[PDB]
A paper describes a structure:
The [name] acriflavine resistance protein D ([name]) is an efflux pump that belongs to the resistance-nodulation-cell division (RND) superfamily. Within the HAE-RND class of membrane proteins, [name] is distinct in that it is a specific aminoglycoside efflux pump that mediates resistance to a variety of aminoglycoside drugs, including amikacin, gentamicin, neomycin, kanamycin, and tobramycin. It works in conjunction with the AcrA periplasmic membrane fusion protein and the TolC outer membrane channel to eliminate aminoglycosides and minimize the toxicity of these drugs.
The structure of dimeric [name] depicts that these two [name] protomers are nearly identical and display an “extrusion” conformational state. Based on this unique structure, the dimeric [name] structure may represent an intermediate that this pump must go through to progress into a trimeric assembly. Three-dimensional reconstitutions of these particles allowed us to obtain cryo-EM maps of trimeric, dimeric, and monomeric [name] at nominal resolutions of 3.09 Å, 2.95 Å, and 7.66 Å, respectively.
Author numbering:
A (entry chain B): 1 to 1034
B (entry chain A): 1 to 211, 237 to 1034
Write the structure that this text describes.
Amino acid sequence: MANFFIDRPIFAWVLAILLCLTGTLAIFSLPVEQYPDLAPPNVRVTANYPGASAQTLENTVTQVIEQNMTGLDNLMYMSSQSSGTGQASVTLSFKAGTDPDEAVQQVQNQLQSAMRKLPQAVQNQGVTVRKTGDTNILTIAFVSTDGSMDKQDIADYVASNIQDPLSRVNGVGDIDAYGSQYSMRIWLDPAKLNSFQMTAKDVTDAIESQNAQIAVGQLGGTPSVDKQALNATINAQSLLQTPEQFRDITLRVNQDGSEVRLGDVATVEMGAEKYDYLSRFNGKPASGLGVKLASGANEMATAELVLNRLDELAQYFPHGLEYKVAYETTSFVKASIEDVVKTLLEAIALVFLVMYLFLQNFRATLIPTIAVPVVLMGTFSVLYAFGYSVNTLTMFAMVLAIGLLVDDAIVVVENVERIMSEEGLTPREATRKSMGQIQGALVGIAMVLSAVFVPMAFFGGTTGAIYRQFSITIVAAMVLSVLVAMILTPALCATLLKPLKKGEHHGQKGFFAWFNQMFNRNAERYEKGVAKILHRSLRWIVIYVLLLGGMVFLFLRLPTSFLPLEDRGMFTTSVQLPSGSTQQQTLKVVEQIEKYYFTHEKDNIMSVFATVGSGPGGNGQNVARMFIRLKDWSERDSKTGTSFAIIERATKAFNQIKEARVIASSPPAISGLGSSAGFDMELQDHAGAGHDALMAARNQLLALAAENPELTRVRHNGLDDSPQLQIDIDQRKAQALGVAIDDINDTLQTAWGSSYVNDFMDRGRVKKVYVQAAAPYRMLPDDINLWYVRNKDGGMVPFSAFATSRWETGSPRLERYNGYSAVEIVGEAAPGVSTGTAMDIMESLVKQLPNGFGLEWTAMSYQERLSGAQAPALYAISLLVVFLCLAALYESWSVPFSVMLVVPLGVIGALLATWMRGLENDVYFQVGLLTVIGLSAKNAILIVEFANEMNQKGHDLFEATLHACRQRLRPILMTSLAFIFGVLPMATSTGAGSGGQHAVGTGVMGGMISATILAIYFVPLFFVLVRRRFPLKP
Amino acid sequence: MANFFIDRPIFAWVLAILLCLTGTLAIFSLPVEQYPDLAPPNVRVTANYPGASAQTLENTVTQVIEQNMTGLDNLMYMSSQSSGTGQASVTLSFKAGTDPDEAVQQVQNQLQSAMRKLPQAVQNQGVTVRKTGDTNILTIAFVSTDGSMDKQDIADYVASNIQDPLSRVNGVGDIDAYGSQYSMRIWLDPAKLNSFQMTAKDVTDAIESQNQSLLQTPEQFRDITLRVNQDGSEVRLGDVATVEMGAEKYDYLSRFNGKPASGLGVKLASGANEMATAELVLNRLDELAQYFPHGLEYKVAYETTSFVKASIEDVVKTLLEAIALVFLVMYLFLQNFRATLIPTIAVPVVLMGTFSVLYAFGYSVNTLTMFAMVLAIGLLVDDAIVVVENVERIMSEEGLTPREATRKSMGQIQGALVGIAMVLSAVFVPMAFFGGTTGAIYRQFSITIVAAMVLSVLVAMILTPALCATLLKPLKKGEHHGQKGFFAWFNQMFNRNAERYEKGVAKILHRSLRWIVIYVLLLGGMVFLFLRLPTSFLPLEDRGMFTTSVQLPSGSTQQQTLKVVEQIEKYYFTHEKDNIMSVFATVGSGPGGNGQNVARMFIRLKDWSERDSKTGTSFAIIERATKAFNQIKEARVIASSPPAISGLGSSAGFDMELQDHAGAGHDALMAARNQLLALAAENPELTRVRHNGLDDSPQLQIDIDQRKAQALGVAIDDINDTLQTAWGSSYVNDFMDRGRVKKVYVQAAAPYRMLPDDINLWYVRNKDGGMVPFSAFATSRWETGSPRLERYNGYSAVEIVGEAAPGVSTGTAMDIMESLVKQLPNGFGLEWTAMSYQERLSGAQAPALYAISLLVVFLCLAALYESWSVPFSVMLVVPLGVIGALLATWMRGLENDVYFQVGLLTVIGLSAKNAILIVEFANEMNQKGHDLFEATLHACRQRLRPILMTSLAFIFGVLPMATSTGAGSGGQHAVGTGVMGGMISATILAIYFVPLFFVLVRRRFPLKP
């Protein structure tokens, strides 16, 4: 095979160009994203029980749904919430890798059975099963520059002209609006309704009848008269437009001729929602839009399309109105991708430099350099074939691959160079002899570097997904490298390499002469040291045992984590005032926070966008969210301008604040995994005690977490108990009075909340018509008698007759996790503390809690625990696979055992590097450790294969291994330094996702350094000891 | 390999027989169709909101569905229509190659979320998601010869006895009816109603309560007792109404050759074969015809199988003529009959192997595959011709035996055959990877030609050496030439011309500089011709049918449209009597929409044999009609040919969507539409530019004030019910007719629902039971509304369709339309759809295809011959063929369409073939050590005859295509002309330039040793 392409260089060039072209086509047709999926598919079930208390809703609907949904295939955990507004939601998070459509189908199938057990009112209302989505791509703030357009006017214009077209952009699953358009709201006064003996149902029916558009046929229908002139459609009536027309709805005509107009019994206004969001941008009134990513779509492409359309719409904006990007994800993605590309290019440059250092000839340096683009573009082609994308994980895998893929080419080139220098052969003959000598070595190196990354793909969960990204990439790179090393590189060595060795051009005075002298002296000293340690076995055996002990000690000592957080240039601060606080108090707190960010962080904040209030449908106005976008990483300082610092300073300043709970939290590492960064914990109530006991336990846990300095920003992801109305309707009592359940339910909705009747045309735009009770009347336990629902006989039966209301204090939102009443508690570790340590502290604290309360990590915390548990298996399986492959290749059990003894030498170095740098045992460290295992195996192989060949030929074991070390010292050193300087840009990257680059690079670089400086001595020791223990048959 | 089959010919014969048998098996089991599945799949979501205006329907239903359907995988574009009748449809077109079933399933899944958001009435009606067939395979008109049955009689029979059986026929997706079954129509009389003091609601309530035990005859309905007086006298329905057995829907009025008739529109189920389904349907109809009442007979008004069958037969004829011409030219160069037969035997073997490959891949016998076969016929014989020519030359010069000559020849030309197969197959490989309809077309040709090339090389290395060693007579010149007639003169002329050619090649080699400037001029001319050449997607074909559509001003009645229809029928019967077989008009149906002001007319021309070749062409008669129809100012009448691809578009020409990007409103959009139409009418490069929709129609809006309505104690529901019953139609109950359950409708009589003031003739029953006139609480008012509202990709849009003027390509027309849209007021933009979108896609993707194909050929040659010099010498001759292809296309008048693109690829392959046939021998001789000039001159001298015969075989193979006159003449011309010109130029220029390129490259890069 090697000789075939040695004699046919053009064929090898053609194959290389084919690979390059396929890669170039793939690169321009590959989607770009930060992380590929990595999020378990969640399916949400939503049910509504109007006028139902939280406890009643949970008991009647939520628990039934939970019971029926148990037994789903690949289900991971269930999270459910029961709200006081009458809406119940049960989120079903499935195992990662599961197709969302199948999960939705199964959920719907079980909901078919579950529905009949639900209350009939809920069944009539409807139950929805949809994939969650819930990934806010960007938040857009619309602010009036001139100030001419009022905040309500801005909200109306946005919801009328901007929300509709943006909702139809590809990949836009949902677009939340932080402002409500104008609507024909009618405020019923029950005093007037009772005065004229008209119920709310009469008003609703009259509005339906008198505001409608019905087509009644055609003027000049098809069976027409002999000679007609027109064929026109006929409409019964038209939709009301002005509020005055609504005030003229008749509702009755008395025998005297008096009419009870709608304006006489109620008040109509073309206003907005009662409790619409009080959104602000940079201290100015504004509206907002929250664009969410549709499940299974590219965030970058969707954001580009959305922004583009917004630009188009902007062209036709009213004067003074302009949009602002208050929140954006694509920035970081682009910055991180470009930074990793720069790191890859610098890695290629450093590999070229080190190869040129070892190989003075420029062509001899080019020959392995040409392998880099070919293998890289082939890897891109393979990624395109398997449907992968250009993400951070794949680019990290590519940068890690660079050194491994150039290893075989370097080995071939330097073997050819050594043969040319020593035996004085022609480049073609030297290349042929080199291929004959080291055909086995290339295969062994590729096997060891690819066998490590095979078992990873099989693992499941998000961790498995991350591993797979690296596996596919690295395995494809290794396969192409071993293919390139036996196809392209031999031809390049045969042709490009001039016979300058015969020309005796070597010997030029300069830096390279000094380098060669130093290398020769060090090689002689190294061989002497190898001989000495082979004579003095026991001392270095003891040293190896000590190294094993140190490796175990560092493995136990190293803190653990899942993924390093990155400065995305953005963070969110959440404000939660004491329950019952008005919107104005929350606004004042928000203003204080805005002032703090404007004066203290003036050099870093680009824009702050606040969203006061939970919204028109929200129960409380004491909750606000503040989207903060920092300036470009470049502009912000690298020491104090970092989000992590800014967040720490803000956290101290906000803990100083006692008016309300204010927490500044960075966005989560993975978009779909969780809500915010840090650990996520559910405080389950296993004993089944009361909700008050759970609340007391939650308060105690929060106090204990505040006590611990290792924990910071610990908060409850929920709402505190507040007084809430419980309008209870006695169906038997009502039907005894002969009053329809539907009518009383509609009246309850109209009074307690809002009722949608129909649409009306405003300026050519259809807008909804809402009928609501007057401001003082909200179906209080006091005014429930004021409302009447006339029975079938027509008698106005008072609502108080068949129903009762009471102000009962309780939790507005009841949460239930995996069939236990639980409160979700989230928080972050203190600076210098890993997430795993924080989780251990939280477990200790929950142990300190009264018995019956347990914890169960969810989302990112759950998958971090999964990865931590599965890591030892991953290593064991990878080591076993490597050992088996080595045994198969060399048809022996002594050689692989000799090789596998070198793995601790690299593992100790990786552990030391990560420990000294201050990093932690996260997913990246785990993938690194596997790379270090493969690299140590490669370094051991380079010596043991040659020594074993010499032994099988019959050479003396001691002399054979000494000769092997003498010959292969240069290959090990240069294939090692190529990788060490390949990952050097990663370990020293600045900006973008520098955190992930550091986490990946540092461990592998340290592991490589230790692997070389220890293997070049210990590998002879292990091989000699094993062969003496188990000599060959001859 | 070759020597093995030379020693064992029986095994080669067995392999050839196996290939032939497999091909014959495949031919009989391959579907026959015009085109493969080229049209992108479409999924239509229909929702029917009864009693809703178009604007309300769009606001409440169409927009919700559009919002929810966003996010579908492989979605090209989304189009929706909101009709004033109350039916909304959203058409989702996915990328070509997407599985229709997967698309439908995904649409249904994503619709489930949208179901609750829709208005309750819409949900109760039920939204339907189904594949969009929308391909009228067969339009049957039923007419009564004796005149015994009226239009309704015919319609009922059709609906009762014919529509149902044909629906169950396999492959029939939908069967549209241009008529409706009977329905016991009850025409109310307001004067009679007032005389007896009864409202329309009383009649409706009585009838709905009258009811198996259902009334049968109208006389039973006339005796229905509405009420009984105290005196014992009763008021019957006949006293107050006129009951007759009419139609449930009076929408359509169909005429066949001026005679009343009813029609059926048969639509193809997705995936079904068109020809087989049409054959099944017609057969079934004939069976049903066995029981037709006297006089009633069905007549086909629109059929596609005729043109498909005729085109396939024509392509088979041109294929056979190509084989004959290839045999003739080979016999011209190879005077021996057996030497001519040996490559001829390869043609059936390779063809049947290609058919077997097509069957294995699941392809079918369509026009594209057949064109590819015809091209391959010239292509495939190349290797066999080379082998036979080399054997003949060895036998003539060395005098060896046929076995020894074949054995020497195979070793001599082993490389040449592989190179020829590589170059003729590497061009068509990348083309297959392109997507869309264009990609599909490309793939058809690729799969066919690549399989043919592989099989041709296999036959050349297996079967042909055995034939040469056995069939060829050792006495090649036992009686010398043996012909002193035409063959002797031809041989003398060829020898003299070959000597002149060699001398000229030597002269051109000596004078290198002069001809390099000529090559640069040829490059410049090639670029200029490529830029100047107009572009298109596919050639239109005379399919024997065309459709004219009538659209009167909005508000026109059915009779007014019928008058224009009769005028058009008179025009067709007078001016186009000798070319038109039949015309089938359907008042009330139109491509833009349905209404009394729109009519669609189907015209079937006579067979191509009867119609004149110059003045009887579909294009010519259509142009004459458009010249005549533009004089008609009563209505907008446009005669259009069927689209090139059935599922791609509604009609031929371009198809754009003028959409409102600024949301200026519907009125601004209509004003822009009118301005654009005026501009298009002004331009002479455009013709038949029309709006594929309905203009705003007058609407009579009733205004009821509720104060006086409630003052008189009148319910709004009652006044709406009376209005619907009188002006519209009320479905009271059912009645059984001849064992069939049919509807009963109540409506006001014609004279009493014909003017706006007729509202005052009706009365409503108040709470007290009194009669209140409508004039008391109702006033009418005229307004204006849009019967049908269209949206495209979210934006409100109006679909503008049209055709380029004769002599103008579709690409030029699209550019003109883009300029006109630019002339429109700001805020309006355009987006090409249907075939026009695919045309733009192909035009964008063509340069990539060319570059990638050229690169692939270069790399394959470099790998094969292990030298960069050889492909660079070869690839320099590609422009020499491209210039000829462009020149032939420009001279004939064709354009740069898909066929031209596939041709250019074939021309590249052929130029590479000739360049290989020279440079392979030249390079081998130079490698041996021979002088470069001597080597190249010897290569030219030896390979002139193989090149000339392998090229004449191809040119005369494609000559029948370029001169065809059958059904699919346009496509055959488009395919054949460019390739024929490219081959001609490639030969007559390469045979001189290839030596120059090779010598120049070798002198610049001399072989080291």
